[PDB]
Amino acid sequence: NQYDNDVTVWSPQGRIHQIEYAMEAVKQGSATVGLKSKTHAVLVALKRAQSELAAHQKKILHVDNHIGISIAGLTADARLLCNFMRQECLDSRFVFDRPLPVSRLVSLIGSKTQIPTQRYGRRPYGVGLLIAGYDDMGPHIFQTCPSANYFDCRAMSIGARSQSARTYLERHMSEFMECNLNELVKHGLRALRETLPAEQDLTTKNVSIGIVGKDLEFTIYDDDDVSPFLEGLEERP
Amino acid sequence: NPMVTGTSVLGVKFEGGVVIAADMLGSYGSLARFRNISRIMRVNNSTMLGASGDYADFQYLKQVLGQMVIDEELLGDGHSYSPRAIHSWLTRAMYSRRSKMNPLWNTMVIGGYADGESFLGYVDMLGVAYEAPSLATGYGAYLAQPLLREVLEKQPVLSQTEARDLVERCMRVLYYRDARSYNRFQTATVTEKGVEIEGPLSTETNWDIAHM
Amino acid sequence: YDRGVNTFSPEGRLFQVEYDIEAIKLGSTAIGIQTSEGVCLAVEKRITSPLMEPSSIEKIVEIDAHIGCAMSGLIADAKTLIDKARVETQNHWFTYNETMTVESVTQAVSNLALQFGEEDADPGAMSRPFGVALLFGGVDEKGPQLFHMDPSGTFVQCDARAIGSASEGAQSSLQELYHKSMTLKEAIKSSLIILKQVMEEKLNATNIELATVQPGQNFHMFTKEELEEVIKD
Amino acid sequence: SPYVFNGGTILAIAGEDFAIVASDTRLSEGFSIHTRDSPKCYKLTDKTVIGCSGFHGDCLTLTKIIEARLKMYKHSNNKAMTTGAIAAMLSTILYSRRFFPYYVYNIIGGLDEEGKGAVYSFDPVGSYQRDSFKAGGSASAMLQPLLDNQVGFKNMQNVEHVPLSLDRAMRLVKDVFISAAERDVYTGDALRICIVTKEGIREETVSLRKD
Amino acid sequence: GTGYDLSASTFSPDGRVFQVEYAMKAVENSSTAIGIRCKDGVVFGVEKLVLSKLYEEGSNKRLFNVDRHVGMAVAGLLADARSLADIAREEASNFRSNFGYNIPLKHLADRVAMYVHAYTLYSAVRPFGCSFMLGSYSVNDGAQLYMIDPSGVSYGYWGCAIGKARQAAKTEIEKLQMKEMTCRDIVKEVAKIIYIVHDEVKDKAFELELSWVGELTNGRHEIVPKDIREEAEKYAKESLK
Amino acid sequence: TTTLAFKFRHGVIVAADSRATAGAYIASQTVKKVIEINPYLLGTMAGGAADCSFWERLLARQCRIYELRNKERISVAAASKLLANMVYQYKGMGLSMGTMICGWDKRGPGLYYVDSEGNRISGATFSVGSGSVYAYGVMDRGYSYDLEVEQAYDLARRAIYQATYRDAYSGGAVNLYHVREDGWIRVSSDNVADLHEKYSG
Amino acid sequence: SYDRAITVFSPDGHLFQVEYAQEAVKKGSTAVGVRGRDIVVLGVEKKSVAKLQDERTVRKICALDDNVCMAFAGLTADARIVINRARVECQSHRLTVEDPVTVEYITRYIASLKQRYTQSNGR
Amino acid sequence: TTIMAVQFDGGVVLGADSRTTTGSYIANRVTDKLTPIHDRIFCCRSGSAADTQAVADAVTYQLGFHSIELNEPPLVHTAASLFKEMCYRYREDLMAGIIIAGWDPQEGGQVYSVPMGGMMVRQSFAIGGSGSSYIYGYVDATYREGMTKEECLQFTANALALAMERDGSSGGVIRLAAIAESGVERQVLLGDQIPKFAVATL
Q1: Among candidates H123, H110, H92, which has minimal Cα distance to H40?
Q2: 3-class SS at D210?
Q3: How far is residue H6's CA from residue H14's CA, in Å, rounded to a whole number?
Q4: C-alpha R_g of chain G
Q5: Does residue E196 sit in helix, strand or coil?
Q6: Is F15 annotated as a binding residue?
Q7: Which helix (DSSP H) or strand (DSSP E) does residue E207 occupy?
Q8: Cβ of D60 under 8 Å from any chain A Cβ?
């Protein structure tokens, strides 16, 4: 009742309650998924209900010709970190004349987000990120939390009721490393189709898709261009 | 105001690799004070550098580049620097420092060997940067570049030995018709294996013209 | 208080912003809709005495000849972002010699919402957020557009929005009376009848302010006599 | 000194549905030659192109600034930048360093938003204007009169006002650059041309005199 | 205690800075990260638990290369530990830039401990929650092992057992001869230790990390090859039963 | 350079030339020296073009912001004062400027002259450039508040042409403007090679 | 320096410091204003007899310039500060622009001041 | 000024003159140009005296403070690098031309030079000052590998003397110092102790 107001006091059990409270926010928005294959990486977002309290939201952003992101919490902090990443990449390209890798960018993100978790009157960024890119070392998918602890993942989902998507993903894993673009996209869609409340099936006006790889500069797909990808889907059992 | 200076530097690229050459002398004005110092370094396994002009600023850049490479070789991510990035960093450093009227009196020559592709750069005190299959600083631009150009205009595919011998020849000519030189020069190479440096060398010389 | 300002609750939501959004519902009602040939904006004025000439009560302003705005909530904190909007528009016209879109304006204006903190925060900065809801509107390269804002930096495009105290009745009665091929006349008539429905006074000919933006003409704020011909019905 | 003279000339021409930007490919300093391969034309978009001459170190760091600003505009506004906006931005970029300026003469070429041709000339401080033809550089004085005569029909009598084409302008610029090499020393060793039209961009290279 | 535990600038009646006990209580909930030093180098045996196996093999790395000749093994929060790694890297780079030779270990330990202890006095900061260990080897001097707690103490050891199993693991290092055997025939002891100490019902699975420094690596701190990790794991699995 | 301006019964008249040199080399011969600041005010270029353009584009920005904030159009005196005060901060650094602000307000017509040194003065007849002395002499014989628009046009043309016939750094074309109570309008862009025939030349 | 976020929100917006300030204004020598076709009048009531007082020192009404005036009904020191700053601004304006001020101008200035002090830190 | 430093197997030897000048007038004729920095490390000042004294004092302070912590005798490279940085960060305001010499338990006797620029080179022997130009040829024709202690002592003495006859900005007393593992030994030469060379006469 007294350790739950500042980001500095430790609890007798070795926990900081405020960072838990922040993480509780990322698990309030709509779900998002990200995955990768031998030579391609995919991100998918699930704009909800499209007319009421969520009329038209954007959950995918362009960071650079080989890096994109998808957000899962607050939006102002998201734009802040996005601008941060853009400036860092532009500085690398201006200095060395070469694209910045992904792991180093994630390191910088963690270093920046860890500071406010120590000093007074501050609060940590209440946004969870799912990052995708392709460097000389192949494709890469990363996960970032409010607490400055980043993970590398083969396939990860973040948002409301994403546990079912976690189960599904862990189910059909070995099928990866061999499927092409359309196959990976259909996999991701069939995966995030589980979060829904057994109703309000997918449409062409709710899904957003971003795709990257060895021959793509992180292309985006608007509402109208998903239709060619939406076909091939069976009815929910 | 530079006090202890260095003279010309040479660089030429053969097939699959590059070679560089530089003497050993920290001349103070018109005095041969230091005679066993090296003006060539080794950044990493696929990049090497050479400097002219003041020798202290060269040491400063040497220290900074070494620390940069060390900071890179700690994390472990499969990435690394390539001669292009070193070249760009150097050019930007020189430009930014000159825009404040506190330049670095040096003239840099960069070699390298990336995946199947070579490199050979040029950097000046003002930020002038370009590439070419051959180049030279100081008086080497008047007495050495012409020979190299005349040799490439008829054969733009050179082997290791050809480059080595041509380098020795131009160094001999510099020693003949230059006043701030010395007969102790190193000759460095970079192949697909790595970087290698040959010890102190000396050239052959003839003076029979003195009998007329 | 004993809870700071930059704090989270056990639900993932900040406190001060959840508290300021509870104020917007104490302001006047505003409405904004779009059509294939123009956008309409309307606002109500809650006068308090036969005195206080309403000519001074100004809630619809001009960000530029092709962009307007309407506010609700705390009118005081509202006249801090309008100058920023005008500044940015003119700075853009100066550097690039063209007109600023609507999305860029709204993004620049909303980037200033969550800048606040009891600590240093670059002194001369904000100690708390703005309590205001903004509705923009204008024409640009791609037809007429419309946006919306909230005191958390979460703007969203829309086509027919209504804010204020009774923002539910003016939405449940706005979902069914809209089609993608409506004109300006019927648009304004629907807006005015629903305002009548939600107004507290007898809907005098000067208890409201209105404006329109279409490609041909620029930002044009109606007069008192024009507001007569339309109210005859 | 903080400046150097590297030499270099540039030429640009406009038309009804195309634009042309031609330049040399040589870099010198003093009485000697640094290299014979250093072009000046640079592509920014699929419909606009730029040309720079003067001090190299100043012409090499401005291009990066423009590229970055283009990327940032594209990221912020969700659309690419036209030609006039590019020029209005470059004016301010140059005027920022007014008491410590650059020493580069720029020329922009491309297509107007309508589909027509546009060329903009600049000066090292940031004063620009739209034109039909310009030859900023070391050899401007030799080229401007010939272009005046053969594209404006000045000091001519009973001469029609026929329009210009693509092949005609190409041949004209080629002959011009061929002519200006026998009298200027900072010009030669190559020739480059970039054409921009309603179907994108084309590049061409041509041999010249060595000296 | 009413309010004597809300700040790092308050002594309790008996004399105690509770906020530091409360911090170190965090490392008692992490995995075990023992390390030893026999005659020619150091050896760490960190163990990283398996959670949400969707991750890759090599995420949440807990072994940093602080410098060309020293290595770190952490235990506790990873973010604070990464920050401290950056701190140590900066310290060791500045030392070399100013003097001109590889920093020793005693000075590094002392400096980083001063930095860690700076946070145990004021109320405007939070004590760290990580307790790590540094290891190095040189030719002039020998093998050097250390350890730091969130309070700022630096002592030199022959063997440490940071982690939740601080007890029941140090004992397994006593019977060993941590001063005679060479740096090649101890990987097996460390591995069987961290294997038999692990509980198989309270935790699903884990993965084993290692490191190396000494005369074999010429002072350089590098990972342990896999060809020997195979036989190490075989030895452990055969020795457990 | 060569610019002139004078006000009378039917408003203000402005005129300039269309030449731009760099030493002895004529760089441009189609320049536009009558800056169109707005549909209500006007400017003039002399000295350094970059400055005369930048510091008046900024003035346009500020006048627009003023109109937006205060719901009333700005005057001429306030414009000149703003420009002078914004330019006085750079005294002794290398700025070169000479300009005329022309317009119409509730106080009637308006013509002001400004430069970088700091002096700001009204007037009824102004000429600027390296050929203003040759223009003053002929404008002074023919000026009268009670003139007709056609005669004033002819007078401005004649003055500019006679100034061009003597000054080497002045010539090209003659672009004449005219400001009225409801804005301004462009009149003509005559060429000197054709006036020499119409006139006694 | 000082920064503690004196003014903050509440469960219903309800900035309490402003409510308290206007509750203070709920006292403080009621004033009155009127506007006619030819004349503008404005008065104020004196709370005390205070025979020993020198009236010219305790005046509530004041002047910002030859064209403008003002009254107030709260605290006196804050009012003095506001009046002084408004005088400064009304004199600076006439310097840049060659004409006097209007009433809307100075009123907007005064109100923006109060808003800024309502939103800032330590104030 | 004229300073010289030589290296032998188990230690080193230093040598300097004893004159200071402010034009054509001699302000001092005994000055000491050998400044200890630690128990077994020395220095040799040249150029301006103020700057040399300040730099040497600051280096001594830093080195003592750095050695009292590590609990180990310092090295010569450390002091040389400190000098390098201090004279390179202010190369537009200083005129020092310094030499360093000493002993340490890891490596034997060590010598380094640090001219006005801010460089750092180690060499088998070193010299500095204005009167050195007049002996650049004598140290070259006499040096030989395998020299003992007394040999280095008399060598330094002779070179100093030969530089103090032709130069007007140097002369007086010859100060010497021998450094080794056991300890330090100072020495001073004057009058009939200094060497002499017969003057040429026709």
Answers
A1: H110
A2: coil
A3: 6
A4: 17
A5: helix
A6: no
A7: strand E206-208
A8: no
Helix (H, G, I), strand (E, B) or coil at D104: strand
What are the backbone dihedrals phi and psi of residue E113, each rounded to the nearest 5 degrees, phi first?
-70, -40
Chains that touch F (3 or more CB pairs under 8 A): C, D, G
Contact across the interface for H119 and B55, Cβ inside 8 Å: yes
Mutate to test the interface with D, among A63, A90, A222 (most CBs of D within 10 A): A90
Cα–Cα distance for residue pair C223/C204, rounded to 1 Å: 14
- Do F77 and G105 count as a contact with CB atoms less than 8 A apart? no
| Domain hosting residue F155, numbered range | 1-200
Q: Tell me, what CATH number does F80's domain have?
A: 3.60.20.10
Of chain E residues 137-166, which have a CB less than 8 A from chain H?
Answer: 140
List chain A residues with CB under 8 Å of D68.
90, 93-94
3-state helix, strand, coil in chain D (%, to 5): 30, 30, 40
CATH number of H92's domain: 3.60.20.10
Q: How far apart are CA C155 and CA A191, in angstroms?
A: 29
Angle between helices D56-77 and C102-110 (to 10 degrees): 90
Which residue from A minimizes the CA distance to B95? Answer: A95
Nearest to A96 among B75, B78, B88 (CB): B88
- Name residue E133's beta-bridge partners: E73
- Extended strands (E) in chain G: 31-35, 40-44, 62-65, 68-70
Structure tokens at E14: 């008996």
Query: Experimental method for this entry?
Result: cryo-EM
Q: Write down which chains contact chain C via at least 3 CB pairs under 8 A.
A: A, D, F, G
Name which of D61, D64, D99 to mutate to probe chain B: the one with the most chain B Cβ atoms within 10 A of its Cβ: D61
- Among chain F residues, the shortest Cα distance to D155 is held by F193
N residues, chain A:
237
Measured between alpha carbons, how far is A179 from B194 in angstroms, rounded to an integer?
A: 39
Which CATH number is associated with domain C1-233?
3.60.20.10
Instruction: Work out whether the CA dihedral B134, B138, B140, B143 comes out positive or negative.
Output: positive
Which residue in H has a C-alpha nearest to residue E109's C-alpha? H70
Query: Which residue in C80, C123, C131 is closest to G1 by CB distance?
Result: C123
CATH topology of domain B1-212: Glutamine Phosphoribosylpyrophosphate, subunit 1, domain 1 (3.60.20)
Fold of A1-234: Glutamine Phosphoribosylpyrophosphate, subunit 1, domain 1 (3.60.20)
The sheet carrying F173-180 orders its strands as F125-129, F2-8, F11-16, F173-180, F183-191
Which 3-state string (H, E, C) describes H102-159?
Answer: ECCCCCCCEEEEECCCCCCEECCEEEECHHHHHHCCHHHHHCCCCCCHHHHHHHHHHH
Task: Give the CATH number, domain containing residue E166.
Answer: 3.60.20.10
User: Resolution of the deposited coordinates, in angstroms?
Assistant: 3.1
**Nearest-CA distance H44 → chain B (Å):** 19
Determine if residue D179 is left, alpha or beta; phi over 0 gives left, psi from -120 to 50 gives alpha, anything else beta: alpha
Q: Could you tell me if residue C72 is left (phi over 0), alpha (psi between -120 and 50 degrees) or otherwise beta?
A: beta
| CB D93, CB D62: distance < 8 Å | yes
| Cα-to-chain-centroid distance, residue D88 | 17
DSSP string, A56-115: S---EEEEETTEEEEE-S-SHHHHHHHHHHHHHHHHHHHHTSS---SHHHHHHHHHHHHG
Q: How far is C115 from chain A (nearest CA, A)?
A: 10
Residue of C nearest to G114 (CA): C76
Using CA atoms of G75, G76, G82, G87 in order, give the dihedral in degrees to the nearest 10. Answer: 150
Domains of chain D from N-terminus onward: 1-211 (3.60.20.10)
E89–B63: do the CB atoms touch at under 8 Å? no
One-letter amino acid of G5: A
